[PDB]
Amino acid sequence: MTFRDTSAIASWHAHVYFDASSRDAAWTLREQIEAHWSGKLQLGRFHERPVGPHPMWSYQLAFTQEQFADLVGWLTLNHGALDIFLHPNTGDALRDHRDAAVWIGHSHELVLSAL
Amino acid sequence: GMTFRDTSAIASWHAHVYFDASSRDAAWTLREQIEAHWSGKLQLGRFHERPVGPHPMWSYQLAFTQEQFADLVGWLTLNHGALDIFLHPNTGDALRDHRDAAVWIGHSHELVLSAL
Numbered sequence: 241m242t243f244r245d246t247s248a249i250a251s252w253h254a255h256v257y258f259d260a261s262s263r264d265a266a267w268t269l270r271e272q273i274e275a276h277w278s279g280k281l282q283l284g285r286f287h288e289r290p291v292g293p294h295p296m297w298s299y300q301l302a303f304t305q306e307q308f309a310d311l312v313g314w315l316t317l318n319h320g321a322l323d324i325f326l327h328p329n330t331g332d333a334l335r336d337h338r339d340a341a342v343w344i345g346h347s348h349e350l351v352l353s354a355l
Numbered sequence: 356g357m358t359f360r361d362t363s364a365i366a367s368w369h370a371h372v373y374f375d376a377s378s379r380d381a382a383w384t385l386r387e388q389i390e391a392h393w394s395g396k397l398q399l400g401r402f403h404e405r406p407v408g409p410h411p412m413w414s415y416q417l418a419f420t421q422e423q424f425a426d427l428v429g430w431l432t433l434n435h436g437a438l439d440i441f442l443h444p445n446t447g448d449a450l451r452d453h454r455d456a457a458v459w460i461g462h463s464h465e466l467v468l469s470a471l
Contacts, residue, residue, distance in 0.1 A: 246425075246426070246429040248433060249429060249433070306425075308425045308428070309421060309425040310362060312458075313444070316444060316458055317360040317444070317456065318359050328433070341460075342432055342460050344458050345463070346463045
């Protein structure tokens with residue numbers, strides 16, 4: 241393979257994964273993300289069903305390479321028992337999710353057929 | 356109910372590149388490119404071809420600061436290939452840093468936490 245630089249990355253997404261057992265925790269973290277960054281981070285719907293490539297219930301957060309250290313550091317400290325799926329967006333969704341998956345906690349098998 | 360921490364709680368980060376006999380050449384190539392790219396400025400451990408410490412796979416260690424995190428981890432996410440990479444912060448709590456603050460580029464693995 242050939243080495244790429246970080247300019248390849250357009251944006252990052254993080255997806256907070258949860259289920260019925262962890263719904264309250266996921267909602268609390270959502271409220272805290274809103275508060276901590278004062279609603280300046282793009283935030284998707286609180287999906288209580290599997291959507292797209294996501295095998296768990298999820299919600300999406302979007303941010304840049306320039307916010308990556310702050311957001312990922314903070315999520316690493318504060319995610320609790322919730323797994324978080326992170327991936328860069330480079331313009332090739334399948335490649336990004338298949339090959340550039342990062343996980344805070346534990347990894348999950350994605351529904352790649354959705355991409 | 357969680358008590359939230361600020362990123363200031365992080366002293367430094369460690370990363371471990373995991374590999375096996377099948378991927379040792381790829382592990383080595385990455386190793387030598389990390390050396391090249393950062394001009395030997397990133398603290399780098401031995402190329403361990405056995406499980407060491409909490410690590411269930413063959414591994415080598417990198418140590419780096421929060422201020423180096425985005426450059427290094429962004430690059431590793433793009434360039435790690437088949438190699439899973441274990442990352443964790445150092446906050447002064449070895450067990451919880453490994454068990455509860457684990458980050459994985461690729462796939463997660465079960466750590467041998469009794470090693471700690």
